């Protein structure tokens, strides 16, 4: 068992000092209001997840009722509304091309829809099988390759055209529930119950780095725009930010009144902004460098489940459990 | 903006369909079945999960039958009733008791009532012999009373359990009616 001992000794050897001392020389972001400017209303039950398109104008959101709808955020009209074959969903995905939508959950079978059809209506273009656990994330990789994370302690990258699996990753001992894709679309980071965040390479299917900064679990995940760093949430009210080079935890956010779990995290183009949602009906906007509170974002009377900024970073959408979707700026 | 008006009309049609769907959804009540599960679902009627629709007394009920259940319970807050079925032929009985104790004390499953069901009474009577490993007894009626006594003791500590002896459709109907009546009474501060 000396391998882990020497690994941690080598890791601590390169960690001569933290970055807190040099971070004090930067100008604080100050207080930002970021009041709501739009409200998407019409959902029937609690919202589980939502996603933004590559055009940063349309978005897709699914609720507990059993239907997922696509809003046009600019003019508030609902572009699309599709009832799922089943009645349980957990996550949503918008393809970068904009012609496919992915979803999954308690059904344990992934569904891939085709928005741009010869007929006006849309149908289940592909039915994906091969998961023995509940789906958690279905982030799109390309028009034909999609990576998914389930509750069977393994994740899998599938090819839409052929139907069967292409790559499998079973490194995680616990059930992986968080999955984030890097902007380069080469490596993705996964997180499970056992306080473990692990890198995964699409081409090789062999994990590159492993992390154990958190304690309880990894129920939130995101990627830095730079691509060599990422931040993961936890039930311990902490969002530790790691890197792809030193494998050391950089930031540690603590606050005595939000001890509850953190559901989702996000970022911005500059990276000096971390939007994290909690169980106190608010999404505390945390500074990514000064490690202090920056925003409030108190506009929901129920628990926020999933939040995410747009591709251009011009707006922020927060999905809560009161069938209310709010756009912030 | 000629096509903007058509887009608004399409959105209005989608809103009308959503309103119809919301009326249908509010017309139905949702139940979560845990776990004799096959016999129970067969009686209710007359791959990973089972979703069932059944209408009785002009009231429509959805039924969802499903480590693993951490998130399943977590995202099932707004259910109306949780039916629990435990086999009395069983250890497995201790595991069921531990599961019930864990599920009863949840920080997010408050205000969700449960309905307890006891099955395989005939097999338990034929066996009578679980008293060897359970010395708290110190004939079949007394045995079943003893085996529900500690079950109720663990049950007690908003949500209320409804033990029953095993037809069941009317029992579920009455339990759901009582639960909704109590919820409405507490809404107006009458209970």
């Amino acid at each position, epitope marked *: 068992e000396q391998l882990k001992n020497q690994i941690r000794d080598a890791r601590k050897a390169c960690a001569d000092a933290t970055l807190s001392q040099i971070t004090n020389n930067i100008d604080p972001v100050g207080r930002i209001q970021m009041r709501t400017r739009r409200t998407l209303r019409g959902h029937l039950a609690k919202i589980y997840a939502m996603h933004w398109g590559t055009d940063s*104008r*349309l978005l897709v959101s699914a609720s507990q009722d059993g239907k997922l709808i696509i809003w*046009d955020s600019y003019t508030t009209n609902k*572009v*699309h509304a599709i009832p799922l074959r089943s009645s349980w969903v957990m996550t949503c995905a918008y393809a970068p091309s904009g012609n496919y939508v992915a979803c999954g959950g308690l059904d344990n079978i992934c569904s891939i829809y085709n928005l*741009k059809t*010869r*007929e*006006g*209506n849309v149908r289940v273009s592909r039915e994906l099988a091969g998961h023995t656990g509940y789906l958690s994330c279905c982030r799109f990789l390309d028009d034909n390759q999609i990576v998914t994370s389930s509750g069977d302690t393994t994740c899998a990258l599938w090819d839409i055209e052929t139907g069967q699996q292409t790559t499998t990753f079973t490194g995680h001992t616990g059930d992986v529930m968080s999955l984030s894709l890097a902007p380069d679309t080469r490596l993705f980071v996964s997180g499970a119950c056992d306080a473990s965040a692990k890198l995964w390479d699409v081409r090789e299917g062999m994990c590159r780095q492993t992390f154990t900064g958190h304690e309880s679990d990894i129920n939130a995940i995101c990627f830095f725009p730079n691509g060599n760093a990422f931040a993961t949430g936890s039930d311990d009210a902490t969002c530790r930010l790691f890197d792809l080079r030193a494998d050391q935890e950089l930031m540690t956010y603590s606050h005595d009144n939000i001890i509850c779990g953190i559901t989702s995290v996000s970022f911005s183009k500059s990276g000096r902004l971390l939007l994290a949602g909690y169980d106190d009906f608010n999404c505390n906007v945390w500074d990514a460098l000064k490690a202090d509170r920056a925003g409030v974002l108190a506009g929901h009377d129920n628990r926020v489940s999933c939040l995410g900024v747009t591709d251009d970073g011009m707006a922020v959408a927060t999905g809560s459990w009161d069938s209310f979707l709010k756009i912030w700026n | *903006s*000629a*096509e*903007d*008006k*058509a*887009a608004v*009309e*399409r959105s*209005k*049609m989608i809103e009308k369909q959503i309103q119809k769907d919301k009326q249908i959804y509010r017309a139905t009540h949702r139940l979560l079945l845990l776990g004799g599960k096959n016999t129970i679902v067969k009686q209710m009627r007359i791959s990973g999960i089972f979703e069932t629709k059944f209408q009785v007394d002009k009231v429509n009920f959805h039924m969802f039958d499903v480590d693993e259940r951490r998130k399943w319970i977590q995202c099932f807050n707004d259910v109306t009733a949780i039916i629990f079925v435990t086999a009395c032929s069983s250890n497995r009985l201790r595991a069921s008791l531990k599961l019930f104790d864990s599920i009863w004390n949840n920080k997010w499953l408050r205000d969700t009532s449960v309905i307890l069901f006891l099955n395989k009474q005939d097999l338990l009577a034929e066996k009578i012999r679980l008293e060897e490993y359970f010395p708290e007894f110190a004939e079949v009626i007394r045995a079943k009373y003893f085996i529900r006594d500690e079950f109720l003791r663990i049950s007690t500590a908003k949500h209320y359990c409804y033990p029953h002896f095993t037809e069941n459709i009317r029992r579920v109907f009455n339990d759901c009616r009582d639960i909704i009546q109590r919820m409405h009474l507490r809404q107006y501060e009458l209970l």
Partner: single-chain antibody
Amino acid sequence: VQLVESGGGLVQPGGSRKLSCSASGFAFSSFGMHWVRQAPEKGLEWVAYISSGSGTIYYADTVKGRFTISRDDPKNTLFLQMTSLRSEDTAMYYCVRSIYYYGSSPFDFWGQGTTLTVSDIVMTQATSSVPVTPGESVSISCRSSKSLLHSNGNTYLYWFLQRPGQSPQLLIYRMSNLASGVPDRFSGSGSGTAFTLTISRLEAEDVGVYYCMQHLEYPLTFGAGTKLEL
């Protein structure tokens, strides 16, 4: 998807005529529909339009009180009624579909068309017949009296190049986007008043007459068209 048109013939003037358009292959209930007319020696002229929900009904300015149009989703067939028709309607009618949402493709499919015989934005296509050579770039021009640029930023202009004998095929929609089935050699550009079509290479299928459509207001006036020969 298929569109079948029935009706027409030779009747006395000032009568009532029924035209039926049946759609087989797609759910036309959530589809706007348009009735257009084409004269034997002139271009197409917009007649009527019905929304998906049959809520708002619009009519051509030339004839308003002598036309009726309705649809029946369960019957999968829409009907058009002519009353007190004159002798000028010796035209062939096209029923077309159009779905309206963000990033949609209105007027995607055009019906076969059935023959029948007894203030507003206008376009002036100066060119009538310009011969072309194989493997040569072709430039077409459309001029609009009124600016087609809206506050949103999308110009509502469409191209409906008529093949010589069959129904029109949609080529460019909104002057910038690319249609589903069309060679990539076609390109469109403009500034708001003059719109240009550029063609790199042409073939036998490329032979046709190009039509110009505006969609900002609801005159729905067509252009003149340009003929090309090889």
